[PDB]
């Protein structure tokens, strides 16, 4: 019971698979509970305005001015004609920051695509703030595109509001989520040429996703694991990192091929343990988990995609009985560390602090969390809506 909408979706990280999948292997994409939020509210004032505090940008549009356009030019929906016209509607000042130019065109594209079937363009105050470190291959984009999706579907009533009962959170039905997915994926294409769809799927469905040769599959429910996201703030060129492995594979086939196969076996095994774990996470299960992380990390190193920072990330953590492994392109970026139950909270804090006393960013979150959701504008942290208010 509420016209005002509060939706959130998680970003994504690769647990196992990093560079193997590019070669026919199995990757395991999990949701990173470093959630992104969207506050949607219908106004009487004929104006649609977008506020993204995280980036410090705010834009608005005269609903009247938008309704005017014969926005009928709306499968490969991303058209040169479309994107072009959309920029006209946009109003992005000539020389404009790349980041917000994409943030706005994804909004407009979606606003106009869904509010399209609406007898009249609604006037709403949009605000999106995220917990997700921007530009670290964490999927902050699709978390966004997923929220602007779920929210806009709910408003236009193309999809029902699942909160309708009296909880603090709730999720759409299986059918609606698919609609939410197909839509977000669209903005994603509106921005990232030819994305795979792993990021939106993760943000939409949450939990664990399996990625093979072009296809995606959800994993049998397995509880969310507590981790430690670590950013080494060390820049890196994903495209280059992926070429280094392609070249290293051509040069050393009889050597790398098997290596890939061992990574593959790792995802397979992790998948197994996750599943069987779903039930009662027994110590052996975590052991096995830390065990897989070590091997994957070293394998990734053998592929020559590791880095001084990561070796440090892994060393500082290992000295304390915790295991870490880079996630993503490698060569810097972020890493993952697994916290199993039992470990004294402070010692989890100390480890957190050590990583920071390196010039590293280290947030304690969880992996394999819920997925796109909606909340009662009274729950969550206070520093959250404050960032969505102030």
Curated annotation (Swiss-Prot):
It is linked to Mevalonic aciduria: Accumulation of mevalonic acid which causes a variety of symptoms such as psychomotor retardation, dysmorphic features, cataracts, hepatosplenomegaly, lymphadenopathy, anemia, hypotonia, myopathy, and ataxia. Hyperimmunoglobulinemia D and periodic fever syndrome: Autosomal recessive disease characterized by recurrent episodes of unexplained high fever associated with skin rash, diarrhea, adenopathy (swollen, tender lymph nodes), arthralgias and/or arthritis. Concentration of IgD, and often IgA, are above normal. This is Mevalonate kinase. Its EC number is 2.7.1.36. It is found in: Cytoplasm; Peroxisome. Changing residue 199 to A: No change in protein stability. Loss of kinase activity. Normal affinities for ATP and mevalonate. Changing residue 144 to A: No effect on kinase activity. Approximately 4- and 8-fold decrease affinities for ATP and mevalonate, respectively. Its main location: cytoplasm. GO terms for molecular function: ATP binding; identical protein binding; magnesium ion binding; mevalonate kinase activity. NCBIfam families: mevalon_kin (TIGR00549). Keywords: ATP-binding, Cataract, Cholesterol biosynthesis, Cholesterol metabolism, Cytoplasm, Disease variant, Kinase, Lipid biosynthesis, Lipid metabolism, Magnesium, Metal-binding, Nucleotide-binding, Peroxisome, Steroid biosynthesis, Steroid metabolism, Sterol biosynthesis, Sterol metabolism, Transferase. Changing residue 305 to M: In MEVA and HIDS. The active site is at residues 141, 199. Farnesyl pyrophosphate and geranyl pyrophosphate inhibit mevalonate kinase activity by binding competitively at the ATP-binding sites. GO terms for biological process: cholesterol biosynthetic process; isopentenyl diphosphate biosynthetic process, mevalonate pathway; isoprenoid biosynthetic process; negative regulation of inflammatory response. Homodimer. ATP binds at residues 12, 54, 130, 135-141. It catalyses: (R)-mevalonate + ATP = (R)-5-phosphomevalonate + ADP + H(+). Its cofactor is Mg(2+). InterPro entries: GHMP_kinase_C_dom, GHMP_kinase_C_sf, GHMP_kinase_N_dom, GHMP_knse_ATP-bd_CS, Mev_gal_kin, Ribosomal_Su5_D2-typ_SF, Ribsml_uS5_D2-typ_fold_subgr. Mg(2+) binds at residues 141, 188. Pfam families: GHMP_kinases_C (PF08544), GHMP_kinases_N (PF00288).
